[PDB]
Design a binder for this molecule. Structure first.
Ligand code: ATP
Ligand code: ATP
Ligand code: ATP
Ligand code: ATP
Ligand code: ATP
Ligand code: ATP
Ligand code: MN
Ligand code: MN
Ligand code: MN
Ligand code: MN
Ligand code: MN
Ligand code: MN
Lengths: 159, 159, 159, 159, 159, 159
């Protein structure tokens, strides 16, 4: 079957953890939409424009990945995009109770959208965009957790 | 014995989950005070006035329920109201560590107030007011999680 | 109202933690039935008869407590005891998860039997029958965690 | 793409929860192998042959499901079945922790076998084979949690 | 060996829980730096100056404790201070997933800095500075959780 | 100061995870006692003598490590070894809960024996003796998770 999956998030910025997850998704699903939310939600270090461009570059090597931005309800977008699979990354440091809440709400909103939880490499299982941003903003080295293009952009952002 | 119990919260707005919990409480305790906190805590979608009126309507069918608003320390109000039972709803997606912290603090503040944790129906075990508000604010259908009166009020609020 | 509550468990043996919980229960409800399950699958250290005796003496000072043993389905025994409140203790977090399962199953078996979780004192928040037995198997001093009569029995049973 | 997925477990016995998960799997992948592990260390109630039979009938209505038993290393069996997706169900939180261990071990044993966690309906989020057996050992009504043929087998096995 | 340990935090204000942890640290390590972060992070009830002075007084009886303030990355300061041990208090109500995330990030940033988790007395295992501040700000008694000097300062702050 | 630390466990068998933890301990304290408990109730795969031998060789490269077996109460053995630091490893979250219980019990038995939790590398954060044995029972390759001598022993023991 030709499944269309959606992998939503703020990607602010996209990390090696995100790349790990989306790469794993492309191996089991025909088309993967990496959906970037225009979430002013607490000042996106990067803007949607930057957010999208960085993601497009970091996943350019992935043939069946499509980077697209969206506003408001993720489920409404997933429905319009005809996605039937919702990719969620599950870190060792994940808020499981929250993921359950989100998945059940998304199922209520769009039952035809099935939540699929993927696990990243042990290497990226203990980090997050906010932690990375916080560390970088406070003069810490986060080179190891980001694609080269994102690393360069981050330095420009904090300079 | 004639126990007086208090069921505190922001009820912003009251949901079917809250109704579930308070209804279960009225079956084991003589008088249940549904206490609504005037918690400006991050802009109450609804005002205390609205908050109270909506709750009064949603629990009007419950004979031994009294909806009352209060400000500042919940324990101080519970003490003045002569409550000896503190109702706490325990969702499957609850922050247990937080509930423990809260209960122990409340016990220090008022040892004569006993924390009672009740469990809602599987139906409401994965939702919360903030999630409901967030989904509704972003164009999602939350009709299923609210009493009719609250549903109508919510639509007016977001229009 | 005069509610009848049941506090089921293996109580092998009953500890100060159990005493703490049942005591809190007697202050909320008219009559409390401390129900000891045979639990053959657990290969209890003490026989049902022994555990019943131990608990009886350990709770003799509590006028409205009744100790009874049972091998039936807890739900059926609860219904037959005319109990409408099911008491459970919440100390540690992985207990909560297991407790929700039994609670939802028990609600399925007897919907009018309302689950009520109570929280023990900080003093007994880290003990369990199995841990006390483990320490006692190695001759460690567990006098602080058990009722006088239970400690003697545990000592005599292990030597 | 035509992916082959494997859904391993002890299935002692298979429950509606398992049915829920495998069903969600058949809607995402072309072929699903419901693999029943011998699991001698668990001292299963039903023999491998019995569990296989039970599952076969319980999933007969699902065209792209295949039930097979195995005593090999799950990873090796997966490779030999030509599966590239490993299905796992996430109901409760302590499962998630244990699941990450097996997932990371299995990824170490077969890196191309991608772990996929699915979430069951709220309806079966609190049941397990062991709990159903426990209730059944006490003659409790478990018809609601098992496929018709499994319930009969469970009844006949316990009397 | 002569180990130099660092115990970082906002100490806003320092509580009996903090005193408990730092006291335990001084018993196993030669020199303990109680590092106070100048974290404007959501309006420090107390200023760094106040924060430091209160801590110095509350730990004056501890000979090998040095109270020092720092800004930005904790790891950068720890490195400059030549610390090889990082003290983290682990409460029963701790965000473990967060502690893991933090520890792994700190290990990436400074591998020569080893994270050591200490456990406070049952007495302080269910509280935190934010909860204490919130309760006090809302007219609750928090005398029991603070050193006398902090208690006096807190009352002045809220008057 | 010259502290003596004890790292107790069943070590059945000792894994790279254990090696990771004890190694971190030797860098903080002068002398470390890796204490292997008989743990008859666990029905260990290897005898105490075997586990001691295995650990001795597995930690021979660590000058300040001492391997000893014991069947006494861990607290008493710690006191008799003149240890004032109790080393424990924290990998997964349900371990933390169980660890707090033993820690509080051990503090009750020997208040001057301070509990110290260390965190293993991401590399060994998902392994355990039981999981390695489980994989090995099915002939899976576990060379990556065990010291050379332990792997041989495990291979020879299972065939
Ligand atoms: N390092 C990672 N490994 C695996 N999954 C991840 C990782 N980081 C994020 N995810 C997952 O990707 C999705 C989107 O996450 P998001 O865009 O918020 O980035 P984030 O790192 O989680 O941000 P933040 O640090 O603000 O929490 C979520 O399902 C999340 O669990
Ligand atoms: N759906 C629900 N089922 C059971 N208990 C609930 C539910 N929603 C809230 N509660 C409980 O009722 C009490 C008050 O909760 P509150 O008023 O904050 O609503 P809320 O849904 O928890 O809000 P929020 O989404 O902002 O977290 C708490 O003890 C909470 O656990
Ligand atoms: N120390 C304690 N504090 C609070 N509740 C407790 C405590 N010990 C047991 N309980 C609760 O009492 C009920 C019965 O528990 P049980 O009879 O199994 O004793 P137990 O200590 O939990 O045994 P075990 O060590 O085998 O787990 C459960 O709901 C349990 O959560
Ligand atoms: N009710 C359920 N809902 C969702 N997933 C489930 C459910 N029961 C089992 N699973 C999942 O299916 C897989 C196999 O589980 P298993 O065969 O052990 O049955 P089980 O119910 O988990 O047994 P037990 O009661 O012995 O723990 C696991 O990944 C498990 O998480
Ligand atoms: N009562 C306590 N017992 C043990 N450790 C504590 C306690 N309070 C704080 N800690 C630990 O000390 C360190 C610093 O904590 P912090 O300075 O943020 O105070 P805090 O109480 O955790 O603040 P907040 O209430 O805002 O969360 C952390 O590692 C934290 O876990
Ligand atoms: N891989 C690991 N990483 C970090 N700490 C570990 C690891 N394995 C064990 N430990 C810790 O070492 C101590 C002793 O553990 P133990 O000897 O039981 O081995 P184990 O792996 O935990 O065994 P089991 O598989 O039976 O649970 C415990 O404090 C435990 O948390
Ligand atoms: Mn996130
Ligand atoms: Mn809430
Ligand atoms: Mn128990
Ligand atoms: Mn299972
Ligand atoms: Mn904090
Ligand atoms: Mn262990």
């Amino acid at each position: 079957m030709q499944k269309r999956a959606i992998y939503p998030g703020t990607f602010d910025p996209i990390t090696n953890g995100h790349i790990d997850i989306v790469t794993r998704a492309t191996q089991m699903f025909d088309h993967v939409i990496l959906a970037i939310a225009a979430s002013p939600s607490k000042k996106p270090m990067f803007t949607l424009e930057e957010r999208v461009a960085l993601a497009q570059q970091a996943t350019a090597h992935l043939g069946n990945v499509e980077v697209v931005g969206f506003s408001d309800l993720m489920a409404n977008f997933a429905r319009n995009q005809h996605a039937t699979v919702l990719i969620r990354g599950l870190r060792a440091v994940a808020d499981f109770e929250y993921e359950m809440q989100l998945a059940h709400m998304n199922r209520h909103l769009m039952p035809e959208l099935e939540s699929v939880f993927l696990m990243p490499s042990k290497e990226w299982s203990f980090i997050s965009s906010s932690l990375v941003k916080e560390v970088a903003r406070h003069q810490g080295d986060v080179t190891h957790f980001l694609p080269e293009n994102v690393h360069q952009a981050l330095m420009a952002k904090l300079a």
